Design a protein around this ligand. Structure first.
Ligand code: GTF
Ligand code: GTF
Ligand code: GTF
Ligand code: ADP
Ligand code: ADP
Ligand code: ADP
Ligand code: NA
Ligand code: NA
Ligand code: NA
Lengths: 535, 535, 535
């Protein structure tokens, strides 16, 4: 058949939850047996978010192919089984970089290179590249209709709709319908004005998704329909929900997938949302409760840890354990000591870069190891666990990473090219990104949990365990639970004189889903439940 | 010398409280000794609110000169001591009516009559007529910037700004800065887009008033300033408040009146808000509480009783009593009996037209008279009090108004022209609107409260007390407390053998203010608390 | 003093003559003794027009510093004596290239890189770099207000106006006021709508320049003023003129420079336009007439030869000779023979790249040399003259450039790195751009005309005269009139058995002005006049 496109735009404000709405609609369509994908067009000038700081736009998501992407691709993978790659996310920066490359080396044959057709052509080419082969492609346009930054994306998708044909293309626009407490009604005026803004760029929306802190009533939806040239049945209410896993059900109950399947002439069975109903059921029927402390340096922006927070909740689902996630600043552990780590059933130290707040994480790893509090360390969380054990068990005073203290005597963490021992003796793309096969060691906690000899997890780090100093830490009782590659790089460590102490170099949070959970997070939350019971 | 204008527009949504914001700014400027006025330009086609239904439109406000005006002119008179007239409110309807009549007459000398200049000229003439002679004129533009209905007003004030000069004109634009729960941010984007919309009409705002459920922080105000060509100190936060009487102080604390006085080269002393400080104090520090039942036929829209609800609150301020106003549908009294009138410390029956729910009100007046529950009847509320006393004390079976039962035996309430006795015997402009001098009766409860032989109150009514049946009601012990005119029309009735029972034909709520209160409402709330003690 | 900025935008259509209007205003201000510069912001993605084809956007202008720029910088240098450089022209491509470079190497320190502030900051930095030091800086914004491509430039200059202050910044907007033949009036509606478009982006224009095929009358200018918030005196008529040299006078006669000097508080004497009055006088008072054939490959777009065409007219001014420039396709000379070169008083072969139409130019050079028709060859025009003489006089059959026939026996024109002789023997940044000192040979025609031993002219070429084959062409009677550099590269050749035959490698048209003329073009047109008289 001919691939169909749903272009998803946002009006009035950002932070509408456009990724989650697009992902939720994708989940309904996939549950009708359709081959569906999603792609994110970001109006940022960054060629990719690989440079970007976690405390700016949130977590840097990593795909299998090692692309550094917007955290929305995390939402996409948690809602649909279509695996994301580089071609599901691109920026204005990427588009201009490509056109500039082609221009400087004569591809345009002396032409004036213009926003139209050259920038718009490059956008359309990347949409087609990511989309063609699928039944339905959701194309999420970042930025707000009415702003400068999204205009080339909007002009590009306007052209695509005409070329491909309106039998194969739909415009789905999200707006804010805010509640005015003073008047006790939700307001359609921003929707009315946002639709006129979208039309002024050349796009008639086919479907309006109305974000509000409550259902948009029939009268307000009829008024939006009346002023926006949209059928009343294509005006959809997407209220604030306590669980994003409910959104597929809410959209399906308003016939959104039926409307799309009719417009695209797709003859497919009714969506079976049993898998989402199950996740909701699990969430609403916990048997016990745990408090897990996430001790990191980016807690001021929780979205810095989006996938980790979701992974912990998924750990809860599989154990019927309600997880109270307590975000704790590692700098507060440096200031106020281990007093603030009290009342925790488990401690997670997530990924990060830079020395700021790391000594707090090392102190935190110490506290969890000594007091037998279940511990999961991710990337930096593994480094601080290795440093902790190197210093306080293997008696390597001031043991550190070359990232933090370049000239330290015991660089137990360092770049492969920097590897040295305590006497400064040496051996005879440092950045690891995306899916890597990891060999699990027999009689390791993780080799049981994963229940396989080999696993595939995703990396985003350059600072490795120093193999030259590892043997001394192994003598002192630290277990290597996982390795990878020719250089036998350390992937997982365990402290076996402890009910549950695991730390990995990879980001297991990136392969966790609400439906399939994750062996490591399920095990971590189980251990948290067991600890809570023993108190 | 030269009259200054502040044009006040609204963006994003209506229900911003633009009239209250304008009235609040006018209160600060009046408190600096300036001669200030406010006018409301309504984009509705109704020539005036005279026809409009309370349930749909809200209360019809009446000025001294007997103009039927927008509810907002009530806010104006409650915030400043400048008296409103016909000149302070006009509609699109009034403007097109003016121009159509000039055209049909032949004033335009066979010219093509156009939105510009003819409609815009008619708007500017009415603004100048209302404004000139004042130091500062606040011109509130109804409707939302971006809608069709306000465009002629916006083009008119754009022209006025250029003609009069920008040394004497400012544009003050209200927007919504909504809060997004999921991001914990207030959003400037709607303000950004609304200012571009206002610019697209030809108006650069000078001052932005940011309505939000919370204070708009410095970063958000700075961002608005950056995108809107507005100095940061001219971006004002007008958060949701528990009392509108706080708004003058909140605007003063942000230097709004200083900015305006500087722009207009007005050298005047600092605003003395001591009277508003007293009002805010009184409201926050009630010594006792009362429940007053307002029994009417429009309670489905409380704004139908805007000035009555405010007058009750002001009654509370003067006696240091918190007033819990219970809105009771008079038809529920017809249906479920007088049981729904229990737990009331006082009963108010306000104005209204048409028979629907009136029998419930008559029964309510009976219940209040027989159980010694304090009673204030306003217009219809007086009619039902006379009808009650006529029926159940003066033994006039089925005594009614000709408005409701035209051919009733005892029309104790009827038009002056319709006046007849029980046998059908007669004596050998009916609508009363605006200020009327009323003579009070010596030793009456109202002669006391008002402390004058003559008072001025405002009428909006047609149906009078039938003087041919009055003497019979007087014999049964009803006291006439006030009269007016050559026709000796009954203005106020009292029931002696009652702690507090007053009913008046005029609307005393239209002369009540938070600062000076109202003798009648002060008396009524005083009686309500005295009753509440005796229980 | 503080540098003042005039931001010059275009509305309704492109091809308004915005460069010439900005240049003409600059000429008035310079004639008031002000230090004035102009810069062009082009919304094209090309990093520069160095790649761009002549038959797309017109001639590639070259500044002294060797920057390849928009032809508008040619207008700037012909109207003001402030010499242009790289910093007087930049593109969107250049801006994005710079921001992308900075981003990929961590200058933004993990920030999200955005159109605002990062793209707008980069634009503002380049405006300040090109402007600061001058009294008045004219900033010409390419593209049309209302289009996507100019929005970042427009947002950038909006920010600059607020930051620098409106005491130092003016917005000057050009619009089309088209004539409707059917109704016999010029139309202000496009101006009205274009101004609202500009305002919707956040810019209130201060000055409106109305382009029309006739003066915009007082009534139409008053109507524009009324609807656009612009004083009537700041609405300027810029009609179509027969000579662009008249434009400074037309703008001065409407008080435009007075208005600018008042807004910027610049106390300077009345503009003395004597130099422009002289150019106009010369143009209007020729003594004789000549027809000069320009034989090239880009004649379908005359703007491909903008500076050459102006240089020929300037040649006319200095001789009081009216020059009829006949554009002749060199491919028509290949097809139809030298029949179409009849009735020419002189022949100019301008610059170009690619073999298409070159054999026609060689044939043309032959015709001019043999029939004693005055000849000027520029760059390619010199190559074809050398080829002509090499082939038909020095008996080097099929003598050619390596650009056209790489493997030819006699590459008399070739890259320095390709230099070889007829037997394939060799010697024991190829691109030359911008100002180069050239040594003129004693007893050469050019050493007289330039009347100096050394001259500075501007290059844009890589294909040089082959020194290894030159001596043989010199033996055959060709004179080398000019050389440059260590490699003694041939800059000028002459055929001395001819009244006037000169060809240069440089682009003398780039240093020609209407006021100062050019020694070489003056001499060329003189020779054309002398030839015309001899017939
Ligand atoms: N394009 C338009 C649309 C409407 N209106 C005018 O808009 C007016 C109503 O204004 P409101 O009550 O603020 O708007 P609402 O649409 O009900 O939106 P909300 O859901 O935010 O309350 C009518 O007089 C009108 F006349 F209908 C207008 O003038 N031009
Ligand atoms: N005219 C404009 C203005 C801004 N932006 C772009 O707007 C983007 C930021 O979008 P956000 O975070 O949703 O907007 P905010 O302005 O912070 O407003 P809020 O207070 O509602 O959050 C930048 O990349 C940009 F580039 F700055 C734009 O493209 N065109
Ligand atoms: N913003 C505006 C401006 C004007 N008009 C209306 O525009 C109408 C006149 O239309 P025309 O004759 O085509 O316009 P012109 O301005 O004279 O421009 P041109 O110079 O191109 O002829 C009036 O009825 C109006 F009413 F004045 C309008 O409705 N809204
Ligand atoms: N239905 C919903 N109810 C509550 N929060 C939601 C909902 N959908 C999304 N969110 C949250 O809203 C926030 C904003 O989402 P984001 O992806 O930044 O929006 P946008 O794509 O429009 O910029 C996120 O924290 C997201 O989890
Ligand atoms: N600052 C404020 N805080 C709380 N409520 C407010 C505030 N300002 C106004 N209100 C309330 O909000 C409503 C304003 O609606 P309205 O005056 O009709 O809107 P507009 O002035 O935009 O036409 C009223 O119910 C008023 O009491
Ligand atoms: N006053 C004028 N009269 C006639 N032609 C003019 C005038 N001003 C400019 N032109 C011509 O108009 C054409 C368009 O100029 P151009 O620089 O392309 O405009 P823009 O900068 O708006 O794109 C050029 O050929 C230019 O020489
Ligand atoms: Na409404
Ligand atoms: Na923002
Ligand atoms: Na007209």
């Amino acid at each position: 058949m001919t691939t169909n496109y749903i272009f998803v735009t946002g009006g009035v404000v950002s932070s509408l939850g456009k990724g989650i709405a697009a992902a939720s609609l994708a989940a309904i369509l996939e549950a009708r047996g359709l081959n569906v994908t999603i792609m994110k067009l970001d109006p940022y000038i960054n060629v990719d978010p690989g440079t970007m700081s976690p405390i700016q736009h949130g977590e840097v998501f990593v795909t299998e192919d090692g692309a550094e992407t917007d955290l929305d691709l995390g939402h996409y993978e948690r809602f649909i089984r279509t695996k994301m790659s580089r071609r599901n996310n691109f920026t204005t920066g990427r588009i201009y970089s490509d056109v500039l490359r082609k221009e400087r080396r004569g591809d345009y044959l002396g032409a004036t290179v213009q926003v139209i057709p050259h920038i718009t052509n490059a956008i359309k080419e990347r949409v087609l590249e990511g989309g063609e082969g699928h039944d339905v492609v959701l194309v999420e346009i970042g930025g707000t209709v009415g702003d400068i930054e999204s205009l080339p994306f909007l002009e590009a998708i306007r052209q695509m709709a005409v070329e491909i044909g309106r039998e194969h293309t739909l415009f789905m626009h999200l707006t804010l319908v805010p509640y005015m407490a003073a008047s006790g009604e939700v307001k359609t005026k921003p929707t009315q004005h946002s639709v006129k803004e979208l039309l002024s760029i050349g796009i008639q929306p086919d479907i309006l998704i109305c974000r509000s802190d409550r259902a948009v009533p029939a009268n307000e939806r009829a008024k939006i329909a009346l002023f926006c040239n949209v059928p009343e049945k294509a005006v959809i209410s997407l209220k604030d929900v306590d669980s994003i896993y409910k959104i597929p059900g809410l959209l399906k109950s308003q016939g959104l997938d039926d409307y799309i399947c009719k417009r695209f002439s797709l003859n497919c069975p009714e969506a079976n949302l049993s898998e989402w109903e199950q996740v909701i059921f699990e969430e609403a029927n916990p048997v016990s409760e745990v408090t897990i402390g996430m001790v990191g340096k980016y807690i001021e922006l929780p979205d810095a840890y989006k996938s980790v927070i979701e992974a912990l909740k998924h750990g809860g689902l599989k154990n019927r354990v309600s997880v109270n996630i307590k975000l704790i600043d590692s700098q507060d552990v440096e200031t106020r000591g281990v007093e603030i780590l009290k009342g925790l059933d488990a401690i997670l130290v997530p990924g990060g870069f830079g020395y700021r707040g790391v000594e707090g994480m090392i102190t935190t790893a110490r506290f969890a190891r000594e007091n037998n509090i279940p511990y999961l360390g991710i990337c930096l969380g593994m480094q601080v666990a290795l440093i902790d054990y190197a210093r306080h068990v293997a008696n390597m005073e001031n043991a550190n990473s070359t990232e933090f203290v370049p000239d330290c005597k015991y660089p137990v963490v360092a770049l492969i090219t920097e590897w040295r021992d305590e006497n400064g003796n040496v051996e005879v793309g440092t950045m690891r990104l995306g899916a890597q096969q990891c060999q699990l060691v027999d009689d390791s906690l993780v080799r049981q949990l994963y229940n396989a000899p080999t696993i595939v997890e995703r990396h985003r780090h350059r600072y490795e365990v120093n193999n030259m100093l590892l043997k001394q830490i192994e003598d002192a009782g630290l277990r290597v639970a996982g390795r990878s590659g020719d250089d036998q790089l350390v992937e997982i460590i365990e402290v076996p004189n402890h009910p549950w102490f695991v730390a990995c170099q990879f980001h297991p949070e990136f392969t966790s889903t609400p439906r399939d959970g994750h062996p490591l997070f399920a095990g971590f939350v189980k251990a948290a439940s067991e600890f809570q019971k023993r108190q």
